[PDB]
């Protein structure tokens, strides 16, 4: 049902955040535990980034594919139901958006707590996000 692809979501999710602590074992492996519990911290905030960023561009996708849905039901649907679908999927293009501006907001601070450990934790997190989101599409 929608069970199914909520647990498919689940796990790509779940994926996601086993690669990014992955490499957040790698990168803490040549740090005193003093300083891997703060790439630890940097890893769950990383996991968070790649959430958002694959939650946004699925949303900006489907906002996208339903204007387009509407743009051929051209004189199939009164102007009126237009206007009413063509605002309620550009509200979910926005709070796509604000996803994006969240995740970027977090990723400025990490920047601001270990630049590379960010980087390389942020790099992971977006990659395992296109992988995902490209196995679903």
Same mark, same amino acid.
């Given at each position: 049902? +929608? +069970? @199914?692809?909520?647990?498919?979501?689940? @796990? @790509?999710?779940?994926?996601?955040?086993?690669?990014?602590?992955?490499?957040? @074992?790698?990168?803490?492996?040549?740090?005193?535990? &003093?300083?891997?519990?703060?790439?630890?911290?940097?890893?769950?905030?990383?996991?968070?980034?790649?959430?958002?960023?694959?939650?946004?561009? *699925?949303?900006?996708?489907?906002?996208?594919?339903?204007?387009?849905?509407?743009?051929?039901?051209?004189?199939?649907? +009164?102007?009126?139901?237009?206007?009413?679908?063509?605002?309620?999927?550009?509200? &979910?293009?926005?709070?796509?958006?604000?996803?994006?501006a969240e995740?970027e907001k977090i990723?400025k601070?990490?920047?601001?707590?270990?630049?590379?450990?960010?980087?390389? *934790?942020?790099?992971?997190?977006?990659?395992?996000?296109?992988?995902?989101?490209?196995?679903? *599409?």
């Open positions: 049902i +929608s +069970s @199914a692809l909520q647990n498919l979501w689940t @796990a @790509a999710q779940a994926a996601m955040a086993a690669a990014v602590k992955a490499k957040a @074992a790698e990168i803490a492996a040549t740090k005193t535990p &003093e300083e891997a519990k703060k790439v630890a911290e940097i890893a769950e905030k990383a996991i968070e980034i790649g959430k958002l960023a694959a939650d946004a561009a *699925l949303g900006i996708a489907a906002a996208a594919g339903g204007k387009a849905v509407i743009a051929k039901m051209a004189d199939g649907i +009164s102007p009126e139901k237009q206007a009413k679908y063509l605002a309620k999927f550009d509200a &979910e293009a926005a709070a796509a958006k604000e996803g994006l995740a990723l601070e990490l920047l601001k707590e270990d630049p590379e450990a960010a980087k390389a *934790l942020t790099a992971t997190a977006l990659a395992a996000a296109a992988a995902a989101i490209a196995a679903l *599409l």
